[PDB]
Amino acid sequence: DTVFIRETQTPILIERQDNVLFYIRLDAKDSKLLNEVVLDFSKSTPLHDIQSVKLYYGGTEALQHRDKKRMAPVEYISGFHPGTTLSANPSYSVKCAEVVRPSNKVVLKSNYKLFPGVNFFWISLQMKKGTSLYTRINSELCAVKVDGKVLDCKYLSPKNISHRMAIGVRHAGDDGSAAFRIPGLVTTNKGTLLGVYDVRYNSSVDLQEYVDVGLSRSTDGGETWEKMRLPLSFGEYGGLPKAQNGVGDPSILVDTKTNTVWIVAAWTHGMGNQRAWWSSHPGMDMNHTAQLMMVKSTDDGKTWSEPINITEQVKDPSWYFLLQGPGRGITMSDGTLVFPTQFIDSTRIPNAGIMYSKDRGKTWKMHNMARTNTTEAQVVEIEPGVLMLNMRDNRGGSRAVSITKDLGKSWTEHASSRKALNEPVCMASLLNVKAQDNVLNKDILLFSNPNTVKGRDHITIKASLDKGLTWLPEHQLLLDEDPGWGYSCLTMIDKETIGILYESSVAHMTFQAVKLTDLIK
Amino acid sequence: DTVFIRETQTPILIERQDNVLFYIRLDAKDSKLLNEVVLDFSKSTPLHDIQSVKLYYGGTEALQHRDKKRMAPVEYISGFHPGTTLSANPSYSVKCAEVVRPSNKVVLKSNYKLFPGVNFFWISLQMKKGTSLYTRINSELCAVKVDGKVLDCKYLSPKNISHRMAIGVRHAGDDGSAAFRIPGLVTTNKGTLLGVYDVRYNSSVDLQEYVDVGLSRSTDGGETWEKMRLPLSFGEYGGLPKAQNGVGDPSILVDTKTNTVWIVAAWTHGMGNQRAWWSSHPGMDMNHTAQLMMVKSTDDGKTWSEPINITEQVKDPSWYFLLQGPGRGITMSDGTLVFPTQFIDSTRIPNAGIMYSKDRGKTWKMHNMARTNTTEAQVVEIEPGVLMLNMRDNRGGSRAVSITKDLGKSWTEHASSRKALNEPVCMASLLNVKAQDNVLNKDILLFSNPNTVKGRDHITIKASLDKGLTWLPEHQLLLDEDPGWGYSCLTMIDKETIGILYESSVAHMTFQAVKLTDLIK
Amino acid sequence: DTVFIRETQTPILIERQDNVLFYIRLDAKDSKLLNEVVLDFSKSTPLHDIQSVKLYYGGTEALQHRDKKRMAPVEYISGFHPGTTLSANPSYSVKCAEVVRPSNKVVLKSNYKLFPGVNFFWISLQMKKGTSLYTRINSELCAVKVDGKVLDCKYLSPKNISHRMAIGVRHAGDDGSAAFRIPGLVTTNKGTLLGVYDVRYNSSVDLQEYVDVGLSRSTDGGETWEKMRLPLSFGEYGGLPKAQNGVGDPSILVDTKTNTVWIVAAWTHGMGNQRAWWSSHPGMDMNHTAQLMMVKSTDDGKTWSEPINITEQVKDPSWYFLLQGPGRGITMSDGTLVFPTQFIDSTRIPNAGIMYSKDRGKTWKMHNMARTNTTEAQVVEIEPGVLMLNMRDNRGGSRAVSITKDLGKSWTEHASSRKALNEPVCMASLLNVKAQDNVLNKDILLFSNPNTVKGRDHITIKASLDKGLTWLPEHQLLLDEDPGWGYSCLTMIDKETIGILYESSVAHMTFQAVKLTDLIK
Ligand SMILES: CC(=O)N[C@H]1[C@H]([C@H](O)[C@H](O)CO)OC(C(=O)O)=C[C@@H]1O
Ligand SMILES: CC(=O)N[C@H]1[C@H]([C@H](O)[C@H](O)CO)OC(C(=O)O)=C[C@@H]1O
Ligand SMILES: CC(=O)N[C@H]1[C@H]([C@H](O)[C@H](O)CO)OC(C(=O)O)=C[C@@H]1O
């Protein structure tokens, strides 16, 4: 017979009880017993870090569904059902075998009775609790033995996959919140990691709703995270319900001249239970339009000021909706702080741009839009005094890229625009790492998004060595092949290590660490 | 100004901390203060049963959404979110006022500051723990005072609403199950109430999935219910996951000759995670087709036999799918036991019919379909030896009704067929009560169904006094105007009272008691 | 083996070279030859009217598609491809046999080699050129013989089907027009039939586009139709393209006092190539909003006046769009002429109503809407001075029905609103036939539409004998089971005969005559 094998390319959550490593499907109807499955973990693998390898049985397939060649009948582990994302759903899988503290060779003896039809199996990988974020797992499926015969394997995945670790900074249901979304991430001058996100208590739906801006803080490069803080929350302001007071879509930056940290977010007041994208209207006060609120921290992110309403400084009253671009912002070489922005103009078309402060965040200003019918953007200083804006474009298919040398007074279309970086119309993260700040001593531009033109899957980091003109395939790393909500934010953990917080297929707020030399060998 | 008022016509769950009694909408944009709201409970209302009356504020509405003239911005209390259906979502409502242990006149003093636009309020009713299923609440909204002025009330709901109690036998999330569906209900010869249903552990989706048949048993007329039992469950039969072993769509009956209780259900084995409606195929064994399984109890519902597979007795091998009609079956005067049935034939068309036993349930037989393109049905003995089958009809609009005098060898279209009983294509309950068995000393046919042609809402009981020829509007009672999953099943609690177990807007398995004299005055 | 049989319930176009009478599907994989098919035509059938009966082979089915149990692999005859709707597509069917001038017993000898799998056949009925609209064909499928053996027939269609003739007054492609839509039909005082419709030259899409109002006139009760006329056409008015000058959605009425015939239609000027539903705006002139235009004929419909612009007489300036309800209007008992209407108000919501004239059509007036969120409607005088408006309702599922005794100043909800009459949100025809004007000497209310809650198919005529309170199944007639565009319009051809012009599955403008006694026996 033939045995279809599909090895996964998904984050291994350290804290998870099960992680899908392999899917196995057997089509023979005359078979009776699965004797064993044999695996081998290479010596490059930190072998002492694997707690357990298990073999699960997933049953059979509906007869009219078998033509489609699905590798499982159902999702065995959920990354989205609140409170139960850390374990395999026991009603969907039957554990057939287990090797605890495996060596290089793993022999899962099951002698399990088979259905007269399709049979599904899968291999679960469970890491030890204190495992390092840099542990990489390589695994070879050596043999599938059915009815005494070792069968021929047909692989649907590439060879030499390296499985990477992740920590779920937030999971569905944590701290009473159904969902967490829209991540931002920075590293302070002291090396502290600060990740921000929407705390969406009632559901995953956008504003308007009961939404706070939360923050996780790590002092050890992301191995552990402190209890969630709430830098922005407005409760029952004005007497209205909490769900008519949400604040979200955070963007965070570190003022590198002083280590003051800033968070800007959009506060929606009223608007029933409708979406703010359609409910924010012209005007300037909270009863008409979303409010642009900013908080700061002068103690390395531990405590946060009371919100400051900066709406009047930057919003044209004719606009329907002004808000920041989610993710992060920057400090320019000359000390200017910059936040990406987006506004819906009087004709109900969104346009991306930037706001900037030359007085350490006390006053902010917006000059002109970068491009029509664009929304979420991130910005970088690609040369001293030259800003590059990388934009979600409603035309579809690819990121728009524009340049400004005058803080947004006039814009130029970049050569890479609407060609080089494909997207499914989604948030994308851009981060420039100057030669002086990384071990390769070369300017490296990093980009992260779902590497498709349709669908939020295959979350990928890409690197450019020519200031974003070309993105060579060999300088990219696939992080998550499965579907998720798609948003991500990059930061440098240290001079040689990238950190990423993103919405993944395994956890709402997923954190991973990647050696720069893994992207650029 | 004007103040829109809408009184609810929805079950008052005794165990709930909140129940929506009134919706209130104020349109004045220039107003400043809601001073008070005044309520009155008639002297007919047992006031000693009310724990508390509350005034809640629901905020305002999106400016572009005010066209649609709803009465609230969001659903304040959920009947479907697992684990949280018994209290109002505190993020959607702000409590303004509360009167504990009210008297006839209730003054809810709030002096609550209003939004410059639409303002939503609502009144919550909380009953005491020991409240009876027969308590009636009549409530009159006397005044809404804004800025010192009593405003003009415009009511969107009729006068003389009497609010009726209910008990949630099963609620979303109970005993670890996401949902409960498909109710059946009978009264044993000892007056014991037995209610059956799907226990749908993972979600509300139909077979195939992890589904058991559960049962709730009450010896006090439905005021209290014993711990859930599982008369049918197949676990990991054959080594397949539990989710590939569901059993559901139960039908229950009482052999009135002996008080033996019978439950029949459809067991689906394998089939992946697809719907049994498409995945059950021709054949006879479990690896091909759904199995028709039966359990019995001879101790008044307390314990249950192991399942009996009767598939081979009644199923034609060419049918794709044979199953019972959910709800209940009957004992005919001559002792014949009858269960409605439905099968998908080789043409992929479903057809309703009946199966019967002449030997107290030891063997069962099926003859011919009653009507093409029909599914779920319920049956009564409308005259001696004459069965009436009332059918969900895929043509749409109304119930089909057919008669058989030879246990399904030949069928006749009934005069009421496809004209009198409107439906949105959904399960409906039918129950016949002979003159000698009820306090009105009239033969009474009872029907329960969502009283619509589209949408599963306005669950209503209808009564016919001429053996189902006519359904006069004055002999109908609205129980639940809000949306739900729509199924229901009737029984006689006693000679004076109807019991109904149904899927409601407030609980997955909702029980209510209704005096025959409320229906027939 | 088994042979699945589906007899059709669709109009037989007299002018068609082929009409599908039976679908045949054989699932046997070991069979070799279809020897023959034997048909029987009753002696009620005027046999002299059948030109030919044919047996066609339609080939096989995709292997993954077979479980769906379709009765054909493809549509054998198109009602919609311009210029090719009158013959079977010969690339989809191979002719196996033919009986020209059949007698009562028809033997189609084929000895046709069968595919080793699913095999499709079908039987074609072709009528003689001069056949009458009243001819009825009753046909029995006597035997399907495969490999010498008469097979067991499994019917998907009811017994006692009577196949009815139809004439395609307009077919896709006729007179250079891609499409014809939106029928209206009346009978003048002289018995002349007048059918009006959109002539949609470029495609089937709604205004704006190159659209005229066309008219077919018959002096022999619909057996033959005069060359198409154009009562309304605007060409390059103002110098804009013909496609920025369309007029459509006609409504026609006979002033029975004088036999003057009126047609009202909506003329859209400019608006690029967008849909008038969104492009007509507030105002009154043609450069801003659709114009309500009227023409009259005083010579029994042979010639038509130049259009009169009556917009200023009844349009409120704040409305986005005012137009007639397509179909027909009435002449009330007191001489008032009445057209149903529909307007999109300043809040972008559509509402139905009526306009009327008390001076023989010289001046027109509108009072108040009947109901919110309603569009197309038809009106009758259900009793002297009492108008019944039957409305397409955007809430879905069923017609709204309202009553006015003061020509739209005030409205009352009819008992049947949103309960009695089913609907998929589509145009529907309503026509009242007074006792003295028909042969049953009873008031008869007639209704025609797609008899579904979803999908435009099963075009059906329904009759009510109690002024629209009840619509009994026995007084209904299915005309066309297959999908079409769904609009229809009724008239009385004479005191004994209904006429209907409608969009069918076989022709854009399909005309049929139906005896009143066939509806009400
Ligand atoms: C105001 C608001 O909520 N915006 C939402 C954003 C935006 O709507 C898109 O960029 C425009 O198309 O999209 C998403 C998303 O689910 O991807 C989340 C944001 O919360
Ligand atoms: C096997 C199965 O689950 N059937 C499902 C049933 C059926 O499909 C329909 O009656 C005909 O299509 O419908 C429903 C329903 O609430 O709508 C519930 C049943 O669980
Ligand atoms: C102005 C216009 O085009 N009206 C169109 C109508 C209308 O859009 C709907 O009644 C309200 O939405 O719909 C259709 C249709 O076959 O669906 C045809 C009419 O031409």
Discrete helix count of chain A? 3
**Greatest interface and its residue counts?**
A-B, 43 and 44 residues
Small molecules (ligands, ions, cofactors) in the structure: 2-deoxy-2,3-dehydro-N-acetyl-neuraminic acid
Q: By helix and strand content of chain A, what is the structural category? A: mainly beta
Taking all Cα atoms into account, the compactness measure Rg of chain A is 24 Å
**Main beta-sheet strand count, sense and barrel state of chain A:** 6 strands, mixed
Strand-residue proportion of chain A: over 45%
* Strand numbers in spatial order across the main sheet of chain A: 6-5-8-3-1-12
Oligomer: part of a larger assembly
Q: What gap, in angstroms, lies between the N and C termini of chain A?
A: 41 Å
Counting DSSP E segments of at least 2 residues, the number of strands of chain A comes to 41
**Overall form of chain A:** globular
Helix fraction of chain A, binned, reads: under 10%
PDB class: hydrolase
Keywords: Sialidase, sialic acid inhibitor complex, hydrolase
Entry title: Sialidase682 co-crystallized with inhibitor DANA
Chains A, B, C: BNR/Asp-box repeat protein
Short précis:
Chain A is an all-beta fold.
Question: Which short descriptors sum up this protein?
Answer:
521 residues, globular, mainly beta, sialic acid inhibitor complex, Sialidase, part of a larger assembly, 6-stranded mixed beta sheet, 3 chains, binds 2-deoxy-2,3-dehydro-N-acetyl-neuraminic acid, hydrolase
Explain how this protein is built.
- The structure is cut from a larger assembly and holds three copies of chain A (521 residues).
- The first copy, chain A, has 521 residues and is mainly beta.
- Chain A contains three helices and 41 strands.
- In chain A, strands 6-5-8-3-1-12 form a six-stranded mixed sheet, with no helix packed on it.
- Chain A is globular and about 75 Å long.
- The A-B interface holds A 57-65, 73-74, 89-94, 112-113, 115-117, 201-202, 208, 210, 236, 238-244, 270-274, 278-279, 281, 287 and B 57-65, 73-74, 89-94, 112-113, 115-117, 201-202, 208, 210, 236, 238-244, 270-274, 278-279, 281, 287-288.
- One 2-deoxy-2,3-dehydro-N-acetyl-neuraminic acid (DAN) binds at residues 206-207, 249, 276-277, 375-376 of chain B.
- One 2-deoxy-2,3-dehydro-N-acetyl-neuraminic acid binds at residues 206-207, 249, 276-277, 375-376 of chain B.
